[PDB]
């Protein structure tokens, strides 16, 4: 059983933030990306040191270097390290691509730049999908326009 | 002599329902396929990952047939069988939904999910009746507002 | 700040009235918990037995040091796992005792609801966001801010 | 695409909550900080104890030391407490840092005190960056001002 078609519901929806390419914006962009690259690299280096040390502890369990209980733990360590490395190595990949993408941008171009939680009203006949598709255009922090 | 009449703003879920349409199926199939694909990659990774451990352990022994090595292998085997059984289950569930989707008659109303909403409440309202609003959507367009 | 009003997120304490409809609901959940727990404790032992048997199937020596060891381990786990389940039983039973002791038309805690509100300067933040409602069979009876 | 001129949108926005350093605030920080430290040190003693117990328990469980099973589980416990200990000691060093700051702060100074979720309306021309920069200042429960 139904309610009135007069019924107006308020739902939650994302808003897309697009940025106008300005010089101020490009710096901020690159500086962020760059720190991400660097932070990743640094973690990868720490992961490898952490890996080696933990392996050295486990070895000090058996006088026998061929002991199977030990050897399996090591394999697990390394399997854990490898898969973790592999993951960071992929974040870094994305960041580098973003870096090139950013650097290769011209002034007054318009770029995606994340989402904001928003809300809005819907009623019978409304298009729910188009409601989820509002974007705003920012230029150096100022709302240039609303897009639908 | 006063009587408080404050209205409060609540968060409630709206239930979403979809109309079975060609588009809906097409997009549901995909969603489900993505889940299948995901479970298939996870299943491979588990095995190769487990195989590698078996290999490593055997290699660092100079005798793979040692009663102690065969014990470890027995574990990796049991521990992988345990994780695999669980992943196989998920794939069955997904393939199970795949069937149901294909089975659904065109124009049927089915469950979709939830949207976060927010209504108002004051004394004498049925709080339960306010968490029970539902909407029916056909290819993106809202058809009605039920309970 | 020139008369600015902000809208912020605040929780709402949701109290419930004691109806015989609430007790009935509340008990059935307690009971399900209880029976579920005991059905686990029977399963715990049932399983432990069989595990211990399979272990013993290993060596011909009943007093074998590794058989001895593994058995000890198993039993120490059953010990600990049981501790938890029996602890939850006491919880549930204590709650059960409370649910039965409670007199009709009494107010009990029941969890939170996300809300929002308004704040301006000179406002006391805690007093602006520490409200509660009182519900009896789905119907809001009171609101105490 | 060009949304009907006067369009107003609602978005989620974080509010910074600051506190005025008052006598009755300090006697609240102090008490709460202390219970965190006392309850961190207490968690540590039970950690060491509980580990010890389990070590002796997996000792009388088996026959002799140098046992291949026994080393893997003991060394596993040793590294288990080592980790928990670090994570507890970090919280301590933290709480002790805050305590040091609480005490070494003069009356009527302003201090960060966490975050609240709010919402506001945004329009073409608004400064979005600034919308997010909002802060409130609290003196013993009461709002002293809205900032930025």
UniProtKB/TrEMBL annotation, chain B:
Which segments of the protein form a coiled coil according to its record?
Answer: 25-107
Q: Which domain of life is it from?
A: Bacteria
Supply the name of the protein: YlqD protein
Supply the InterPro entries for this chain. Answer: YlqD
* Keywords, alphabetical: Coiled coil
Organism of origin is Parasynechococcus marenigrum (strain WH8102)
């Amino acid at each position: 059983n139904a309610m009135s078609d007069g019924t107006i519901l308020t739902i939650k929806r994302p808003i897309t933030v697009r940025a106008v390419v300005t010089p101020t914006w490009k710096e901020e962009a690159e500086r962020e990306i760059s720190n991400g690259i660097a932070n990743a690299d640094q973690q990868l280096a720490q992961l490898e040191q952490e890996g080696q040390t933990v392996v050295d502890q486990v070895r000090r369990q058996s006088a026998n270097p061929l002991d199977p209980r030990v050897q399996e733990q090591v394999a697990n360590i390394q399997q854990q390290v490898a898969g973790k490395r592999s993951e960071l190595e992929e974040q870094k990949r994305n960041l580098l691509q973003q870096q090139a993408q950013v650097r290769e941008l011209e002034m007054d171009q318009i770029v995606e730049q994340g989402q904001l939680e928003s809300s809005c009203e819907i009623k019978v006949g409304d298009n729910l999908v188009e409601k989820m598709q509002v974007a705003i255009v920012v230029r150096d922090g100022v709302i240039q326009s609303i897009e639908e």
